[PDB]
Paper text:
Ribose-5-phosphate isomerases catalyze the interconversion of ribulose-5-phosphate and ribose-5-phosphate as an important part of the pentose phosphate pathway. Two types of ribose-5-phosphate isomerases exist, RpiA and RpiB, which share little structural homology and have distinct active sites and mechanisms of action. Although RpiB occurs predominantly in bacteria, here we report crystal structures of a putative RpiB from the pathogenic fungus Coccidioides immitis. The C. immitis RpiB contains the canonical open (α,β) Rossman fold, a common fold for proteins that bind nucleotides or nucleotide-like molecules.
A 1.9 Å resolution apo structure was solved by combined molecular replacement and single wavelength anomalous dispersion (SAD) phasing using a crystal soaked briefly in a solution containing a high concentration of iodide ions. Given that the C. immitis RpiB contains modest sequence identity to other structurally characterized RpiBs, we attempted to solve the crystal structure of C. immitis RpiB by iodide ion single wavelength anomalous dispersion (SAD) phasing, a strategy that has proven successful for structure determination of many SSGCID targets. Attempts to solve the structure by molecular replacement with other RpiBs such as that from Clostridium thermocellum yielded clear rotation and translation solutions, yet poor refinement statistics (R of 0.39 and Rfree 0.47). The oxygen on Cys76 appears to adopt two different orientations contacting the backbone nitrogen and side chain hydroxyl of Thr78 in one orientation and the backbone nitrogens of Gly81 and Val82 in the other. An iodide ion resides in the same place as this chloride ion in both protomers of the asymmetric unit in the iodide-phased structure.
Residue numbers in the entry:
A (entry chain A): 3 to 162
B (entry chain B): 4 to 163
Write the structure that this text describes.
């Protein structure tokens, strides 16, 4: 069935990302490269919970080994990416083109992909999310040494 | 100029050099820029990894030396991830006019990143120009969300 192992995903959004979230969730449920989707929420546009909370929660699922990656939607995709990058060991991007989406994995080993619902169209979002799943980072690559410099910097800090 | 000029840092890896030179030239003529500090690299020969230049530029903001940084690499992703690891720094990759505006007005993001291999130079110049014309409102509702990120960052302490 699948040449590549399926990934476990978290999906998450703020009130501005609800509709693309549901369409993307349905689209990805049909994909054999996805073995599970955990919905962090929000579930409704009335829910005014701020983007940092949701982004940090979804990133914590990755940190705890409960999912492999997270797909995050807000107005622009910016706030959730900033917030997820604040979690030690988590690398997050907003990527709105096919080349960036490939490099987000192959160069940056980024576990979190963020979209701006108000900025890109749904079919492009679906296409990008689908392609994202087909790339797997090489830990022995030249790119991994650069990622290691980010991790080296993160070693400056401890949680108190 | 009706708005105060800003001090800028600019940075790139080897993949971002020609766009950095072009942007620097374009911005040096802009009355909204009071100074530009170029942290490098200055040649495609210089293989210094993107995290070092991004962290150096981000530290200039942290240390009150510049107001904002413009960073260029192949995709703009690696430098944004790197910059977001620096405490109190918020960085975006933003390749459209709506996202650039929201980066400032919603996210108070001091760092803007471009992918030389992903966007065209005229669009990059136009976006960097528009970026300077927005100023974050510290009294806004968006400031509460920004403070939420800042509060998370206080869980970590720099030991090294």
């Amino acid at each position: 069935a699948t040449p590549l192992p399926p990934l476990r995903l978290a999906i998450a959004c703020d009130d501005a990302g609800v509709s693309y979230k549901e369409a993307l969730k349905a689209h990805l449920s049909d994909n054999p490269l996805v073995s599970s989707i955990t919905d962090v929420g929000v579930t409704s546009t009335t829910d005014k919970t701020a983007y940092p909370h949701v982004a940090i929660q979804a990133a914590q699922l990755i940190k705890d080994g409960k999912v492999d990656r997270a797909l995050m939607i807000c107005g622009t995709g910016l706030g959730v990416a900033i917030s997820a990058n604040k979690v030690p060991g988590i690398r997050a991007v907003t990527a709105h083109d096919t080349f960036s989406v490939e490099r987000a994995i192959l160069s940056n080993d980024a576990q979190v992909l963020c979209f701006g619902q108000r900025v890109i169209g749904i079919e492009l979002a679906k296409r990008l999310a689908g392609e994202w799943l087909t790339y797997r980072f090489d830990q022995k690559s030249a790119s991994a040494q650069k990622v290691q410099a980010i991790s080296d910097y993160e070693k400056k800090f401890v949680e108190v």
